[PDB]
């Protein structure tokens, strides 16, 4: 048997319903989502980190000339100058006065700290949604992970539940993301091969251990000071460090809908947007005959206490007269009031107490008891606390 | 190689029921467990009861509790025409012979023929799109799946348990007036029955005469085997104990190798204005696939075993086909 | 078993095994853009006119 239902996407708050066959006792269903995660299609593109100015020993030739040999290291710069008069601790390295030549060749290499400190680039799109559900259909309670796309049902006791796709394809992430130290930021980094000096992406590497890197640090060699063997070099500061000092606030606190971010793998969860539809396929063996369940007669409502707060604040005493003692489900067909419990145990000639939540000053709602209906009515009082520490359990009717 | 033979050295031979040993239902040491036929060139693997290779090429089989052996070149199997034995190790055999409907294997040690026939299909699979019945003398090379000739420790394993307490009506004998149980040399056994009260006794290489139960047909002396093992097969009872105690790996696992496959005759082509006619003279039934090089394929597939003439229309976008195992041929026309 | 995509696919795309992929079939047009440095250019007068 095919049944359709809808669920506002939000964890914690439970959901109660009864499927009512025209000639058999209603079958109860309870649903509780635990975690609703949303994982994107994310493909890694590159990685960056601190760089280190690789500088060999200066190549000095004394009264002669030299040439440049390109090692083809990334962003290599080579230069030769004349008219050098170097010194050493033990006097003069040379005796020549002029014609001396010195050659400098400089480059960049990845810092030793690349493994533990490195910012990753990511291209995100195509969010897929997963969920953990705690569902009980006909006192068959289960906790299970389910693919809530438009296929992939999960079956237990013959009951086949299918959670359809979301009504909204919104995602908190932008197309290009940057990851670092477990924090996530939506940033527009320049793409591979187009890095610029003094900004993010000056040094470029396909992977952590690619061993082939592109670089634009704009390294410039300079004439060393006279009477000293050394090589002065000038370059823009680390754009990674400039971005480190800039660091706009994190997505964990900037995202709308209050979406929390964890990255063991990149994912976002526990934030309410849209609705998830549920499709039940129930086998015909789970339906029980009416005579095998208690049936009531002359049942009446009374409203004992009212507080139309966020939490359940309506207490109702229902007085009944039963042919049998046995548990049955109680349901409110409309959204006027939402009950707290999925089932209530029932004596022969006792009275039942029911907790519910409503936002109506003058509620008048029809409850469905084991096989009959009763019409509870009354007025209700405002709350006392201005703010609470939990969300709303009910809807806001117009 | 003994490192791998010692695994199957210490298990057993065993006997089992047979549908036909040339005389009705029967009990034979030549029961066939199951047949698997997935190899391309017709290589088949058989799982018999008697084990092989234990000595270079010899068979060893049980007979009413006693072991015997025979050289391998005296046992023969067939489906429709005589088959051929390549190699045998442990419980398994590798054979090669064409398709059929049943597997019938037999031998003749004394002047009495032992046989079993079973209805398990064997299927000959042609490699490629050019079907045949016997691989050709010449052709081209392709990668198919054949069962490797080597016996090496792979990851595939089979299960093995302790033997059941098989009965033997021969041991119980009649004295002047009594029933005597005479276990063979150095073997243990267990005698059961209810002729008076209830009796379940054990014997360890001792002959026992029972004063009561002074007749033949009543009751039973089961054997005991401890240092030997059996395969988990439906034709043996399971003794007490749900233990498993070990498993063994299988030889002749499927492998990948180069494979000879036939080549079809070169088609005779005749051209026309946006049309091409094909003359075809297959030696054996062959496939044809033809498709256009446009967004609509209109793919057309045929099996042909007789000569015929087939005309096709080719547009500017292009035509393509394969006839048999030849490389694809693409034809592209122009304005004339 | 049905005919393969390498024998019935449109546009004659050839499919290989190791990465699931297709090659050598014509569809559409690739736009290309070039940023050429001035170093490779030559003066008109230095070329025959």
């Amino acid at each position, epitope marked *: 048997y095919e049944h359709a239902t809808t669920m506002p996407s939000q964890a914690g708050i439970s959901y109660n319903t009864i499927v009512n066959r025209a000639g058999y006792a209603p079958l109860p269903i309870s649903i509780t989502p635990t975690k609703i995660k949303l*994982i*994107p*299609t*994310v*493909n*890694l593109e590159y990685v960056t980190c601190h760089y280190k100015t690789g500088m060999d020993s200066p190549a000095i030739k004394c009264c002669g000339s030299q040439e440049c040999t390109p090692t083809y290291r990334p962003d290599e710069q080579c230069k030769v100058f004349t008219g050098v008069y170097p010194f050493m601790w033990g006097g003069a390295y040379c005796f020549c006065d002029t014609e001396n030549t010195q050659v400098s060749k400089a480059y960049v290499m990845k810092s030793d700290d690349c493994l533990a400190d490195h910012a990753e680039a990511y291209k995100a799109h195509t969010a*897929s949604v997963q969920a953990f559900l705690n569902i009980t259909v006909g006192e068959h309670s289960i906790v299970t992970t389910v693919y809530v796309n438009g296929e992939t049902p999960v079956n237990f006791n013959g009951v086949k539940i299918t959670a359809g796709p979301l009504s909204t394809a919104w995602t908190p992430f932008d197309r290009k993301i940057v990851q670092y130290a477990g924090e996530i930021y939506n940033y527009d980094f320049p793409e591979y091969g187009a890095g610029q000096p003094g900004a993010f992406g000056d040094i470029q590497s396909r*992977t952590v*251990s690619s061993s082939d890197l592109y670089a634009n640090t704009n390294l410039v060699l300079q004439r060393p000071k006279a009477g000293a063997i050394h090589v002065p070099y000038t370059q823009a500061p680390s754009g990674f460090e400039q971005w480190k000092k800039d660091k706009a606030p994190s997505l964990k606190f900037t995202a709308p809908f209050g979406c929390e971010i964890y990255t063991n*793998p990149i994912r976002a969860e526990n934030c309410a947007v849209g609705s998830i539809p549920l499709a039940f396929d129930i086998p015909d063996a789970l339906f029980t005959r009416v005579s095998e369940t208690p049936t009531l007669s002359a049942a009446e409502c009374t409203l004992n206490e009212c507080v139309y707060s966020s939490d359940f604040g309506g207490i109702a005493t229902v007085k009944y007269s039963a042919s049998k003692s046995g548990k049955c489900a109680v349901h409110v067909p409309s959204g006027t009031a939402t009950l707290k419990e999925a089932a209530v145990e029932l004596t022969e000639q006792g009275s039942a107490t029911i907790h519910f939540s409503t936002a109506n000053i003058h509620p008048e709602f029809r409850l469905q008891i084991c096989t009959s209906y009763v019409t509870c009515k009354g007025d209700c009082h405002p709350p006392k606390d201005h703010i609470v520490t939990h969300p709303q359990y009910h809807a806001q009717t117009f | 190689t003994e490192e791998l033979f010692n695994e199957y050295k210490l298990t057993r031979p065993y006997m089992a029921r047979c549908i036909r040993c040339a005389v009705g239902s029967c009990h034979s040491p030549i029961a066939i467990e199951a047949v698997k036929s997935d190899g391309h060139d017709g290589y088949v693997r058989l799982q018999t009861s008697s084990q092989y290779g234990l000595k270079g090429r010899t068979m060893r089989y049980d007979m009413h509790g006693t072991i015997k052996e025979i050289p391998l070149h005296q046992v023969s199997l067939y489906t429709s025409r005589p088959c051929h034995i390549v190699d045998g190790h442990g419980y398994f055999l590798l054979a090669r012979c064409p398709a059929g409907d049943s597997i019938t294997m037999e031998f003749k040690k004394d002047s009495v023929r032992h046989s079993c026939s079973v209805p398990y299909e064997v299927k000959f699979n042609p490699v490629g799109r050019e079907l045949y019945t016997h691989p050709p003398e010449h052709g081209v090379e392709q990668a198919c799946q054949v069962y*490797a000739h*080597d016996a*090496q420790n*792979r*990851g*595939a394993y089979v299960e093995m348990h302790l033997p059941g307490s098989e009965v033997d009506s021969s041991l119980v004998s009649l004295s002047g007036s009594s029933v005597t149980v005479t276990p063979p040399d150095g073997t243990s056994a267990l005698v059961e029955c209810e002729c008076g009260g209830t009796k379940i006794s054990e014997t360890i290489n001792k002959t026992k005469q029972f004063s009561q139960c002074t007749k033949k047909e009543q009751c039973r002396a089961y054997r005991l085997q401890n240092d030997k093992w059996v395969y988990n097969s439906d034709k043996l009872p399971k003794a007490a104990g749900a233990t498993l105690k070990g498993k063994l790996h299988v030889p002749f*696992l499927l*492998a*990948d*190798g*180069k494979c000879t496959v036939p080549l079809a005759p070169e088609p005779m082509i005749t051209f026309g204005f946006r049309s091409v006619s094909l003359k075809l003279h297959p030696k054996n039934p062959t496939y044809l696939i033809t498709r256009q090089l446009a967004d609509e394929p209109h793919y057309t597939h045929e099996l042909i075993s007789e000569p015929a003439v087939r005309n096709f229309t080719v547009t500017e976008k292009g035509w393509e086909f394969v006839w048999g195992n030849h490389p694809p041929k693409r034809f592209w026309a122009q304005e004339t | 078993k049905a005919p393969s995509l390498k024998f019935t696919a449109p546009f004659g795309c050839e499919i290989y095994t*190791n*990465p*699931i992929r297709a090659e050598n079939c014509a569809v559409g047009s690739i736009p290309l853009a070039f940023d050429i440095p001035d170093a490779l250019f030559t003066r008109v007068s230095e070329t025959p006119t």
Partner: nanobody
Amino acid sequence: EVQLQASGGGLVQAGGSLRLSCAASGSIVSINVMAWYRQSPGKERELVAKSSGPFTLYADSVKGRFTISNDAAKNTVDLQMNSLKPEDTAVYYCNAEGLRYPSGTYGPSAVWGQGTQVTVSS
């Protein structure tokens, strides 16, 4: 992205015994297949070893001499290579197929490392 790193090889005399190792790095949790392929100069690519879980498979020209072991926990394969002949010189590549990304953005199926050179001297 997922990659394969190959280590081992070198120049040795005939009759020696070496080990070739290939390791997988990236966003992967389980691997269905890992195999070895050899490419000699002037010829085409051919398979040598074939390992996936407990099962193994060997070619015709490599039986009884080379052994393949796989560690899915480390996602590595070790080809213990013995009884060298002059025909064994080639560049060896390690391949991985049927990759199950840990959701794990689905991506390319197969990968190919740079490989290692093995040369044998008579």
